[PDB]
Design a protein around this ligand. Structure first.
Ligand SMILES: O=C(O)Cn1c(C(=O)NCP(=O)(O)O)cc2ccc3ccccc3c21
Ligand SMILES: O=C(O)Cn1c(C(=O)NCP(=O)(O)O)cc2ccc3ccccc3c21
Lengths: 343, 343
């Protein structure tokens, strides 16, 4: 697989990414100690995940570009830009983990939870953000898509930040209100907090690198990718509760955390006044006796079937979008991504 | 005064800055609630300070530009770019306040300390950062210095972030170590965390807007401004303990907070082994009986006189730099700034 294959070269390029970002220490040894911490920040936070968003940039670049323009440098820039997406993600996860008072990320202790870190991780998160642009300058300054990538990563940060503000306003840290749990809000949080940075940003970066800078091509790609974003999160929320924790490699947290999940949204859309009250109680509770009750109400409301139906219609919808908006790009750009997301 | 005069127009432009940043709500009412919070973030965090860094951009722009090129739009962009510096500063202060577990900023409750905020202020700090670039795109996209300003604000964020990492490594939250309190470190923290963003960034922004984009002109300006930065912080640390709290409008916190202040650095440079131990005890302590002891040791070591001597040599040094590096810029750019900083 394009992904399974290149995952090695992508992860092996990280050694250079680090060497390169820890090279301004040469002229200024005065800040060596801060760069030593900056190294530790990257090693701990950019490494450990699936690298799929970062890999998408590499994969999409190969697919969008004529094989003769794929020289040593072009690929060095594709891996780098791929890494910038991972670095952007590392910056959000470090900060999101602080904000939601989390204990683990990828089964490991959250960076801020590590001794000697704590709220210093707020600065660490900022340094991860700074590196996107440091690399972008180091590898793409002379490229004609340079300004386009800076603006893309910047728009992408803003979009996520807006999404996060929306999420935070919707599900506060100790507020059992389901009035603000509307589908219009769920769809909105997903567009801003996840869909944009996870699906639009990686393909869009490759597009700019390929010379595809047109507003219409990007609008067409944005149309397709944002809908893939929407499904990804809906499936993520379904799998959170009904997924097999062996294959998923994670156990259900959603209900216990008062999350505006797709499941609750649907539950709230299809619930008798008493069923609303049953939820109004058991939601946001750490107690296994209470978590079991919601799981049971969702099941009673045939949400696994409502999800199955949604998955069918969604894949049917994405194909319609790919048909309509992929042109003039290679449909494979989108088809490859959809295959990895759907089942 | 250029400052005292324009402070009104600068502060009155903030109403537009806000209107403009809260205008993407028109096409997307779906995120209205997040923008409503985004409004509250700006009103609370960008307003309330002296606006001197922001004002420097306006003042320097007028001084660097031929009065005929100063049309409605040019000034609208100068006020905006001025505001971006304030927004950059707002982003650091919100985050620094969280990190150092502070109670007040400009005598008012810290944004994060306000009910319903807390660590959500980490995201708020990011939104303040996002706005720099949102405004930059809104007002300067079509200007030839556009990319130069994005890179400037970005380099400036990185520099401060590095400075902050350095500071955090030097003075941890409950670590009485004076081994790392060297002058080389003090000078380093000051260059990165303050001098760059406070003095280089504002003048540099005006320079780019004026067409002054040359590496040498910027190196020459950087030479002068970074030294002004160094004094500013040294005076800030002196005034922290020995300033009249009426005129200063602030009371001494430094010693109680284990800060790598200029005073301690000098105290440590000129201290008998027993004087080292006297400090090793009383420093980082909240007790007024212990804070009085350090104040008394500094006095014993004639640091107010060591500072007076430093101020004299420093002003003498800045004038030498202005003589050597201001050309071809108007020396008044630098002279005006120095007058406001020195006594
Ligand atoms: O990485 C993920 O969370 C999901 N994911 C997966 C995935 O984990 N599939 C299950 P597996 O790794 O066990 O075989 C693949 C893949 C590809 C491209 C992507 C782009 C944006 C966002 C996600 C993406 C993505
Ligand atoms: O605003 C400040 O903290 C200091 N400050 C002052 C100042 O407060 N002077 C005392 P005052 O307001 O009571 O008369 C002025 C002035 C000007 C340009 C500056 C540029 C970068 C950084 C600081 C600056 C600056």
């Amino acid at each position: 697989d394009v992904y399974a294959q290149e995952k090695q070269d992508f992860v092996q390029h990280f050694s250079q990414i680090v060497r390169v970002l820890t090279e301004d220490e040469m002229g200024h040894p005065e800040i060596g100690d801060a760069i030593a911490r900056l190294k530790e920040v990257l090693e701990y936070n950019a490494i450990g995940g699936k690298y799929n968003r970062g890999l998408t940039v590499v994969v999409a670049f190969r697919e969008l570009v004529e094989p003769r323009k794929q020289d040593a440098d072009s690929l060095q820039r594709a891996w780098t830009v791929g890494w910038c997406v991972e670095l952007l993600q590392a910056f959000f996860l470090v900060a999101d983990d602080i904000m939601d008072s989390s204990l683990t990320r990828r089964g490991q202790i959250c960076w801020y939870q590590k001794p000697g870190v704590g709220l210093d991780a707020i600065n660490d998160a900022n340094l991860l953000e700074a590196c996107i642009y440091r690399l972008l300058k180091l590898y793409c300054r002379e490229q004609p898509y340079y300004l386009n990538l800076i603006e893309l990563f910047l728009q992408s940060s803003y979009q996520t930040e807006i999404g996060q503000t929306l999420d935070l306003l919707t599900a506060p840290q100790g507020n059992v209100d389901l009035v603000r749990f509307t589908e219009k809000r769920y769809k909105s949080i997903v567009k801003y907090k996840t869909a944009f940075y996870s699906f639009y940003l990686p393909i869009a970066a490759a597009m700019y690198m390929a010379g595809i800078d047109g507003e219409k091509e990007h609008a067409n790609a944005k149309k397709i990718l944002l809908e893939m974003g929407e499904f990804f999160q809906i499936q993520d929320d379904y799998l959170d509760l009904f997924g097999d924790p062996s294959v998923t490699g994670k156990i259900g947290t959603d209900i216990q955390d008062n999350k505006c999940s797709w499941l609750v949204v649907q539950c709230l859309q299809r619930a008798t006044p008493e069923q609303y009250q049953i939820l109004k109680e058991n939601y946001g509770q750490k107690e296994a006796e209470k978590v079991a009750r919601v799981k049971a109400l969702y099941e009673e409301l045939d949400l696994p079937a409502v999800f199955l139906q949604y998955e069918e219609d969604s894949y049917s919808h994405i194909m319609a979008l790919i048909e309509q908006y992929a042109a003039p790009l290679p449909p494979a750009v989108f088809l490859g991504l959809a295959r990895k997301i759907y089942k």
